[PDB]
Amino acid sequence: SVFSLKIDIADNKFFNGETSPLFSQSQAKLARQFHQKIAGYRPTPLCALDDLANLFGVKKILVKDESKRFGLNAFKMLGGAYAIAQLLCEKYHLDIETLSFEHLKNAIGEKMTFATTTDGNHGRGVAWAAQQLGQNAVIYMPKGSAQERVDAILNLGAECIVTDMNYDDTVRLTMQHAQQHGWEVVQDTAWEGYTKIPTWIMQGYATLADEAVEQMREMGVTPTHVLLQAGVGAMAGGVLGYLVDVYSPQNLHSIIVEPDKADCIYRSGVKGDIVNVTIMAGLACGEPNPLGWEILRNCATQFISCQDSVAALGMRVLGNPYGNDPRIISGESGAVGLGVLAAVHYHPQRQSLMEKLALNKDAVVLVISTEGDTDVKHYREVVWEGKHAVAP
Amino acid sequence: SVFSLKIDIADNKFFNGETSPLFSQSQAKLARQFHQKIAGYRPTPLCALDDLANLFGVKKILVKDESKRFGLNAFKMLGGAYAIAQLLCEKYHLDIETLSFEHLKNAIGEKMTFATTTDGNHGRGVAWAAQQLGQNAVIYMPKGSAQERVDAILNLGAECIVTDMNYDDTVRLTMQHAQQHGWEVVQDTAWEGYTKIPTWIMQGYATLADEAVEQMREMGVTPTHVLLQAGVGAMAGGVLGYLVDVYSPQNLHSIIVEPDKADCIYRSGVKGDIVTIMAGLACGEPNPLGWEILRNCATQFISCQDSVAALGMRVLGNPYGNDPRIISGESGAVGLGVLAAVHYHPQRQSLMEKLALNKDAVVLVISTEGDTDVKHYREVVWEGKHAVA
C-alpha cells in the first residue's frame, strides 16, 4: 500500500569535511583490542538484505545486528565497559593496553561506585561492567520505565531506583547523589567539565564500525551510504568519526535519523548552533552531545526528522524479512534507520525522496540495528498486534 | 498484552462419533500414491513451534505448512489435480496408477475443458492440473480479485475472466457457460446432482493428513487437538474424516474455525441443519459432504472475529523464541490465530478449559496457504493493517 509518513530531510549546510582528532581508526582498533579480550566476544553479524534491496531499488542493504552483542541485547556496553575499564585502570595506575579483562576482574584495590541515569541500555552496560569488575553501580531510571529494563539492571547486581521524575530531573538527581556520596558519574553524554568519560564511550562504540568495515571488506563491498539513529549523538558521532576516517566524508553519504519529538540534532543542523529540546527508549535528547555534534556538524551529509511510526515499520520489516533475507530482531530505536528506507519506498514521493537521499541502483546502504527486543512486551505489541500501525 | 477478540465457542451438540468409510485412511493413501508420482513431490513441512507452545501453556503446537505444496503456495492442488486425473481416466479409459503426465501433456485427440469459479487457490490448482495434463481450463474470478491471483492463473496457460459480480453470481455464470459450451464444472463444493468431483477433491486433500500423521509418528507424538479452518468445510471434512479414522473421534479434540461474516458451519452446528470474505474461506452454503463429517465428528465450532487471522499471520511470520518462521496467508493462519487470541484474552483460563487446552495438549494446526497476495501479506505484517486494537 502507498502511505505518507512524515519524513523531513535537510542537507547539512554546515558541512566542512573536517575529520576528528578524538574519534578515528586508531582509537577504535585500540578499543576493539580491549573488547577482543572479554569472555564471549564475537563480532556481531552484518546481515545482507539482498531481496529487500532489490525491492527498494538499491544495490545492497547491510544491517549491523547489535542485538548479538554479548547477551546485553544492544551495542551500548562497547562504550560503557570501555569507559569503566579506563576509569578503573586510571585509579589503579594500570595500563589498559597491556592487560586482559580477566586481569582487571581479579584486580585488587579501592572500590569505586558508578552512578548513571538511563532509559534502558546505557545503564545496563554500566551495570554489566561494574559487576564484571567487582565494583558497585547505582542506576536511576525515570518515571514510567518498563519493569523488564529495571530487572535487567537488578539482575546485574546493581541498585536500580525508579524515580517520580522524568529523564532530566533524574540526571540532576544522579549528579547530586554522586556528589553527596563520592560516586563516579558515568553518562553517555558530555557537558562542561565532563568530556573524559563520554570520549571513551564514543571511542568504544567505534568497535562496531571497525567490525562492519572488516566484514564489508570480506564481502568485497564498499558502502556509499550510512544511516545513523541519534539521541544526543554519541553513537552517531563515534561511529561516523570512524567511518569518515576510512572512507572520507565526501565519499560517504551519511544520514542522521531522529524522531520528530526529540530532533535536537536536526534542529541544530538547520541553525548551525546547539538547539535544546516521551521518546522511544534510546533516542531521547535534551541537549545534543557537544563532542558528537562536532563530528556531525562537520561530516554528516543530511539530517532526518521522522514520524514515530516509522520505527515501528522498521521493526516489522526486519522481523519478517522479504524473499529469502535473514530475520533480524530489532527494538524501536534499533530499527528506525531501516524504517526510513521502508517509509521512503512506499511513499508517494518515492522518486524525489530517493533523489534527495541520493539512493539509486548502485547504493550500498549501511544500517545499524542498535538493540534487539529489550522490551519484549512492546516488541510483540508492534510485530504481532500491529500496535503503532502505519494507518491507525 | 491484553486484548479481547471475539471468539465464539460452541460445543457440537449433534456429535455421534460416526466415522466415514468413504473419507478414511485407504482413500487418502490412494490419493497420496498419485501425488507421490508427480515431479518434485515432497511432503510439506510439519513445523514444531516449541517456544510458542511453552508461552501459550501447551505441550506442542505443530503447523502443517502448505506454502510448500509444490510451487502452488497452497494445499488446493491436492484435491483439484486428483479429481481432474480421475475425470480423465474415467472418460478416456485410463488407469490412474499408470497415468503419465508427459504422455497426456503431448497427446493429440479429444480434450476436456474444465470450468471453475475461484477466489484464488482452487482455480489455480485446476489450472495447474489442466496445464500438466494437456487439457483446457476456463477460470472465473469475482469482482475485486487480486491481480496477482489472476496473473498466476494466466501464467498456467488458462483463461481467466474477472467478472463484475460476487463469488456466488460468478459460480452461476460458470455453470451457465459450461452447460452452454459443454465444459466440465470443477467446483470444490457439492450440491444435488453434483457430488462425485467434490468427493475426489476431499479425498485428495487428505494426503496432507496422511503426511502429517507419518510426520507426527516419526516425531513420536500423538495429537490431542486439531484446528481446522473451514469455508464450506471441504478441507475440514476430508482432513478430519481421515484423522478420526486414525485416532478415533473421541480421542481427538477437533475445533472447526470460521471467520465472522462467513460462519455457515458454526450456524449449522448450533441449529443442526444446513443454513467479499477473506480469500479461501467464503461459504454462503455449507458443503453437504463435508457437513456430514463435521456434524458427526467435530468436537467444537468457532466463530471468530476477522482480525484473528491477521494476528495469526504476524505470529507465524515473526516467531517467538527460536521457533521456525512460517509464511501464512489470511485464511492460512486463522487456526493459529485462535490460539494466539486465546493466550492474550482476559478469559484465557476459561477459554483453554472450554477448549481442553492444557500443559499436555499437542495441537495440530494447518497453514493452508502462503503469501498468495504479497501486497496484502506485507500490508498485514509490515504496515500493521487489520491491527488488534
Nearest to A1 among B311, B314, B383 (CB): B383
The one-letter code for the residue type at A105 is K
Q: Which residues of A322-339 are buried (b: 16+ CB within 10 A; e: fewer)?
A: beebeebbbbbbbbbbbb
Distance from CA of B378 to the nearest CA of A (A): 9
Distance CA A242, CA A226 (A): 12
Residue B18 neighbours by CB under 8 Å, 6+ apart: B296, B297
The one-letter code for the residue type at A282 is G
∠ CA A171-A174-A176 to the nearest 5 degrees? 110
Contacts of B314 in chain A (CB under 8 A): 320, 383-386
Tell if the CB–CB gap between B318 and A317 is shorter than 8 Å: no
Residue A369: its H or E element: strand A364-369
Residue A63: its H or E element: strand A60-65
Q: Are residues A185 and A198 in the same domain?
A: no
Rg (CA), chain A: 20
Q: Are residues A68 and A79 in the same domain?
A: no
Query: Hey, how many other C-beta atoms are within 10 angstroms of the C-beta on A43?
Result: 18
Nearest to B387 among A322, A380, A389 (CB): A389
Q: Are residues B253 and B377 in the same domain?
A: yes
Distance CA A197, CA B370 (A): 52
**DSSP-H helix ranges across A107-186:** 121-132, 147-154, 167-181
Alpha carbon A389 to its chain centroid, in Å, reads 24
Q: Are residues B17 and B67 in the same domain?
A: yes
Provide the grid cell at B105.
501433456
DSSP state at residue B305? -
Distance from CA of B381 to the nearest CA of A (A): 7
Q: Are residues A64 and A87 in the same domain?
A: no
B261 sits in the region (left: phi over 0; alpha: psi -120 to 50; else beta) called: alpha
Distance CA A149, CA B198 (A): 56
Q: Are residues A217 and A350 in the same domain?
A: yes
User: Of how many residues is chain A composed?
Assistant: 392
Q: Which of A325, A379, A385, A387 to mutate to test the interface with B (most CBs of B within 10 A)?
A: A385
Experimental method: X-ray
Q: Are residues B217 and B349 in the same domain?
A: yes
Domain final residue, candidates A163, A193, A223: A193
Q: Are residues B42 and B69 in the same domain?
A: yes
Nearest to B382 among A313, A327, A385 (CB): A313
Alpha carbon B151 to its chain centroid, in Å, reads 22
Give the residue among B325, B240, B328 at the shortest CA–CA distance from B280.
Answer: B328
Nearest-Cα residue of chain B relative to residue A342: B382
Query: Hey, how many other C-beta atoms are within 10 angstroms of the C-beta on B351?
Result: 17
Domain final residue, candidates A193, A215, A242: A193
Give the residue among B354, B342, B271, B341 at the shortest CA–CA distance from B309.
Answer: B341
Strand order from edge to edge, sheet including A136-141 = A159-162, A136-141, A113-117, A184-185
User: Of how many residues is chain B composed?
Assistant: 389
Distance CA B50, CA A296 (A): 46
Residue A230 neighbours by CB under 8 Å, 6+ apart: A236, A256, A257, A258, A265, A283, A285, A292, A296
Contacts of B389 in chain A (CB under 8 A): 385-387
Distance from CA of B174 to the nearest CA of A (A): 32
Tell if the CB–CB gap between B384 and A384 is shorter than 8 Å: no
Contacts of B2 in chain A (CB under 8 A): none
Contacts of B388 in chain A (CB under 8 A): 384-387
Distance from CA of A380 to the nearest CA of B (A): 8
Tell if the CB–CB gap between B383 and A390 is shorter than 8 Å: yes
* Strand ranges (E), chain B: 7-11, 46-48, 60-65, 113-117, 136-141, 159-162, 184-185, 225-229, 253-259, 300-304, 362-367
Domain final residue, candidates B127, B160, B193: B193
- The domain that contains B167 carries what CATH number? 3.40.50.1100
Domain count, chain B: 2
SS3 A256: strand
Contact A228, A235 (CB under 8 A): yes
Alpha carbon A146 to its chain centroid, in Å, reads 19
Q: Are residues B272 and B162 in the same domain?
A: no
Those residues of chain B whose CB sits closer than 8 Å to some CB in chain A are 1, 3, 310-311, 314-315, 317-318, 320, 325, 340, 375, 378-389
Q: Are residues A171 and A24 in the same domain?
A: no
How many beta-carbon contacts under 8 Å exist across A and B?
Answer: 70
Q: Are residues A98 and A123 in the same domain?
A: yes
Q: Kindly provide the resolution of this structure in angstroms, with one decimal.
A: 2.5
Positions of B annotated as catalytic residues are: 76, 119
Nearest-Cα residue of chain A relative to residue B340: A384
> Could you tell me the sign of the dihedral formed by the alpha carbons of A196, A202, A207, A209, in that order?
negative
Provide the grid cell at A329.
530482531
The question of whether A260 is a catalytic residue gets the answer no
Distance CA A198, CA A194 (A): 8
Q: What are phi and psi of A272, to 5 degrees?
A: 100, -25
SS3 A354: helix
* Strand ranges (E), A142-231: 159-162, 184-185, 225-229
A65, A119, A210, A245: the catalytic one is A119
Q: Are residues B96 and B117 in the same domain?
A: yes
Domain span at A118: 75-193
